[PDB]
Design a protein around this ligand. Structure first.
Ligand SMILES: NC(=[NH2+])NCCC[C@H](N)C(=O)O
Length: 225
């Protein structure tokens, strides 16, 4: 559709991040679909909480950036077909990037609410490579994270973000881990457009399918994953 404005908050590696240009897996997917569509595009970096309101007001045409498709979000916006698996977010101090793998988290302590699906996911995906500390609640896990007693926390992101905001901690940020274990697959990550924008949605879906078909998608995946 010749001109398309995308927005994200560039704070979620490896999906999106700051290279003063937005970079990352999602940024490359967006550039690739735009090329496929013969569209001219920009990616704007804006506060996470402003994105959906701005999409609804029509300031942007599309949102992306490690955005998990969820039933709740599907009530507010329309998503494309997913272009990668869903992400489990780890919350950690921004001063130290983490590689979210068995080797990258070697010697780290990860806090989690005990007995939850997040706890099971950590056990299955990391096994004995990490130390898991379990808490009665996400708040208790965060009390340890933000006093330096664990390295990262895994839990419900909207609740965690709410806690961090209420308690005036901007120091802690999210890192995305793609879920490769089919037992924990969700709908995936997708590009969001304004609810009812069927024309753009169809164009984006066709473009995503086309980059999958011509090898462009596979090369982008190989770059990051
Ligand atoms: N661009 C970003 N800051 N993305 C954060 C995404 C966090 C999480 N995956 C979610 O779907 O809510």
């Amino acid at each position: 559709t010749d001109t398309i404005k995308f927005a994200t908050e560039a704070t979620y590696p490896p999906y999106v991040y700051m290279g003063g240009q937005v970079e990352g897996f999602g940024a490359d997917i967006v550039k690739a679909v735009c090329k496929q569509m013969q569209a001219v595009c920009t990616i704007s970096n804006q506060p996470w909480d402003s994105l959906i309101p701005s999409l609804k007001l029509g300031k942007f045409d599309a949102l992306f950036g490690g955005m998990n498709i969820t039933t709740a979000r599907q009530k507010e916006v329309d998503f494309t077909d997913p272009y990668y698996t869903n992400s489990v977010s780890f919350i950690a101090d921004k001063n130290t990037p983490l590689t979210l793998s068995k080797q990258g988290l070697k010697g780290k302590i990860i806090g989690v609410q005990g007995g939850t699906t997040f706890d099971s996911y950590l056990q299955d995906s990391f096994g004995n490579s990490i130390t898991i500390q379990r808490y009665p609640s996400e708040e208790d896990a965060l009390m340890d994270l933000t006093s330096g007693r664990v390295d990262a926390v895994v839990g419900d992101t909207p609740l965690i973000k709410q806690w961090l905001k209420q308690n005036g901690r901007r120091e802690y940020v999210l890192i995305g881990k793609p879920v490769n274990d089919p037992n924990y697959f969700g709908k995936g990550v997708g590009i969001a457009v304004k609810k009812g924008n069927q024309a753009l949605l169809l164009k984006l879906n066709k473009a995503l399918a086309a980059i999958k078909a011509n090898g462009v998608y596979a090369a982008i995946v190989q770059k990051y994953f």
